[model samples]
Target: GNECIRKWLSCVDRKNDCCEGLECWKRRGNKSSVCVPIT
Candidate 1:
């Protein structure tokens, strides 16, 4: 909803928001997440 972390920026787990057009994403076998732009 609001700007928090930018795209490519690592999120502290699964909580982050680059913006509404983007969302926080995580990977398997990983303990961190990233702010990825929505497709």
Candidate 2:
């Protein structure tokens, strides 16, 4: 196991769930997707 540092966020897509408390958002206007932590 390792120490993880990240926060969760409300994503737009319901089907696309983020991992390790990450967030999912559309990068190219819903054409693409990206994952990031809350800051």
Candidate 3:
């Protein structure tokens, strides 16, 4: 398992990473980085 989060769940990895089709990104409106879908 990637231990990857789904949807807009907050990412806890220090690498700021995500699942295969997703990316971990920081949002100005959030307290932490979140898993977002890549276009």
Give candidate 1 regions above 4 Å deviation.
Answer: 1-3, 13-16
Model 2 lowest lDDT segment of ten: 2-11
Candidate 2 RMSD to the real structure: 6.5
Clashing pairs in 2: none
Q: Write the per-residue lDDT of candidate 1 for residues 1-39, one digit (tens) a residue.
A: 454676767776636446556677785667567777888
Shift of residue 37 alpha carbon in model 1, Å: 1.0
Q: What is the lDDT of residue 23 in candidate 2?
A: 63
The full ranking of all candidates by lDDT, starting with the best, is: 3, 1, 2
TM-score of each: 0.53, 0.35, 0.62
1-39 per-residue lDDT for model 2 (tens digits): 543423333445542556665666556655655566645
Clash pairs, candidate 1, are none
lDDT by residue (1-39, candidate 3, tens digit) is: 556567677885733556667787778867788888889
Top-TM-score structure, candidate number: 3
Better of 2 and 3 by TM-score: 3
C-alpha local distance difference test of each model: 0.67, 0.52, 0.71
